Design an enzyme around this catalytic site. Structure first.
Site, PDB file in Angstrom:
ATOM      1  N   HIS B  46       0.800  -1.223   0.000  1.00  0.00           N
ATOM      2  CA  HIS B  46       0.000   0.000   0.000  1.00  0.00           C
ATOM      3  C   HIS B  46       0.828   1.265   0.000  1.00  0.00           C
ATOM      4  O   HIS B  46       1.950   1.296   0.523  1.00  0.00           O
ATOM      5  CB  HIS B  46      -0.901   0.049   1.235  1.00  0.00           C
ATOM      6  N   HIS B  48       1.244   4.718   1.619  1.00  0.00           N
ATOM      7  CA  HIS B  48       0.913   5.397   2.853  1.00  0.00           C
ATOM      8  C   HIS B  48       1.043   6.888   2.613  1.00  0.00           C
ATOM      9  O   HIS B  48       1.628   7.300   1.626  1.00  0.00           O
ATOM     10  CB  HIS B  48       1.804   4.902   3.986  1.00  0.00           C
ATOM     11  N   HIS B  63      -2.815   4.565   5.237  1.00  0.00           N
ATOM     12  CA  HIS B  63      -2.810   4.456   3.775  1.00  0.00           C
ATOM     13  C   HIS B  63      -3.244   5.805   3.193  1.00  0.00           C
ATOM     14  O   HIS B  63      -4.034   6.524   3.804  1.00  0.00           O
ATOM     15  CB  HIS B  63      -3.707   3.309   3.256  1.00  0.00           C
ATOM     16  N   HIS B  71     -10.873   0.954   3.999  1.00  0.00           N
ATOM     17  CA  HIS B  71      -9.941   0.051   3.338  1.00  0.00           C
ATOM     18  C   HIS B  71     -10.668  -0.956   2.461  1.00  0.00           C
ATOM     19  O   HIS B  71     -11.684  -1.521   2.858  1.00  0.00           O
ATOM     20  CB  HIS B  71      -9.059  -0.682   4.357  1.00  0.00           C
ATOM     21  N   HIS B  80      -9.264   2.885  -0.233  1.00  0.00           N
ATOM     22  CA  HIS B  80      -8.329   3.999  -0.152  1.00  0.00           C
ATOM     23  C   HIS B  80      -7.607   4.098  -1.503  1.00  0.00           C
ATOM     24  O   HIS B  80      -7.501   3.106  -2.228  1.00  0.00           O
ATOM     25  CB  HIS B  80      -7.300   3.775   0.955  1.00  0.00           C
ATOM     26  N   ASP B  83      -4.597   1.806  -1.766  1.00  0.00           N
ATOM     27  CA  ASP B  83      -4.936   0.396  -1.589  1.00  0.00           C
ATOM     28  C   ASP B  83      -4.577  -0.450  -2.804  1.00  0.00           C
ATOM     29  O   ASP B  83      -5.408  -0.659  -3.680  1.00  0.00           O
ATOM     30  CB  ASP B  83      -6.428   0.247  -1.288  1.00  0.00           C
ATOM     31  N   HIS B 120       3.901  -4.971   3.631  1.00  0.00           N
ATOM     32  CA  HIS B 120       3.514  -5.420   4.971  1.00  0.00           C
ATOM     33  C   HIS B 120       3.819  -6.898   5.295  1.00  0.00           C
ATOM     34  O   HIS B 120       4.123  -7.713   4.407  1.00  0.00           O
ATOM     35  CB  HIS B 120       2.024  -5.118   5.227  1.00  0.00           C
ATOM     36  N   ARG B 143       4.936  -3.006   9.146  1.00  0.00           N
ATOM     37  CA  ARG B 143       5.601  -2.461   7.969  1.00  0.00           C
ATOM     38  C   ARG B 143       7.015  -3.023   7.884  1.00  0.00           C
ATOM     39  O   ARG B 143       7.852  -2.744   8.735  1.00  0.00           O
ATOM     40  CB  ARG B 143       5.608  -0.926   8.038  1.00  0.00           C
TER      41      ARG B 143
HETATM   42 ZN   LIG Z   1      -6.118   0.874   2.852  1.00  0.00          ZN
END
Ligand SMILES: [Zn+2]
Ligand SMILES: [Zn+2]
Lengths: 153, 153
Positions: B46, B48, B63, B71, B80, B83, B120, B143
């Site tokens: 994702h 951020h 995100h 999400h 998002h 995403d 992630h 992360r």
């Molecule tokens: Zn998200």
């Protein structure tokens, strides 16, 4: 009121955090932070074109030069947009950076968001070294530390 | 015709280079590269919100979510902007990433330039995990590596 941040890392001891703030659209950008690990004295401090760190500081390209000018100091009208002049390290090895500049921006065509802040080995000659490298890099030397300039809160 | 790039680094083994290319403005973004150091299987991937690496991947914030949505996966309507779903690591710990997205951009308000790519720990549940974490992070866990997205040549 745009804000950016840059974390500077290199192959050696030189590291730091540079903050950027622009309270008015296309108004001055305040640049402030601290860089440690430097030798005492003046070090070139420039925005380079690319926020590309794939090959360390080398892949950041040249001083950010959208208007195709010659290298100068911040107070020159002949300068790259990315020409921020020198920062000064004390016997400490810390350079407390505090710059205000109207040529760099955090939005639009002269935005330095996504680009690279580099601190250099040697003093920037501000285009007065009387050779072609002067009008290019200021004779500022190698890249000690850099980071991509990112959007901050 | 914009290009961007990102070097992902973290505290552990995970590290990679991620390239972005947008041939047309407001058109699809191709996100491709590889990440190593990963456990085999699917891993949240994702954008951020902040290009702030001052406290590691943490300072990247949530995100990228300009439209204040929940999400989702990349295919979802409720997602998002940042995403991008999951990426897949093979047995050797290497993830070949190849994504085409139409929601993220390399310019305009949905521009991911100057923001953070994060890979992630766990699989992204795509917002369907049935709790609050799900609707925020996809329960994708910690992360593992990140980098600021910068302008490439
Ligand atoms: Zn998200
Ligand atoms: Zn210059």
């Amino acid at each position: 009121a745009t804000k950016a941040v840059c974390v500077l890392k290199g192959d050696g001891p030189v590291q730091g955090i540079i903050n950027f703030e622009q309270k008015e659209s296309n108004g001055p950008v305040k640049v402030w932070g601290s860089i440690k690990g430097l030798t005492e004295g003046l070090h070139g401090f420039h925005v380079h074109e690319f926020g590309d760190n794939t090959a360390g500081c080398t892949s950041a390209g040249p001083h950010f030069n959208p208007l195709s000018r010659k290298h100068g100091g911040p107070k020159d009208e002949e300068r790259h947009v990315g020409d921020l002049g020198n920062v000064t390290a004390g016997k400490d090895g810390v350079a407390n950076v505090s710059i205000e500049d109207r040529v760099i921006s955090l939005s639009g065509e002269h935005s330095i968001i996504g680009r690279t802040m580099v601190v250099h080995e040697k003093q920037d000659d501000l285009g007065k070294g009387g050779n072609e490298e002067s009008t290019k890099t200021g004779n500022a030397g190698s890249r000690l530390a850099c980071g991509v300039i990112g959007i901050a809160q």
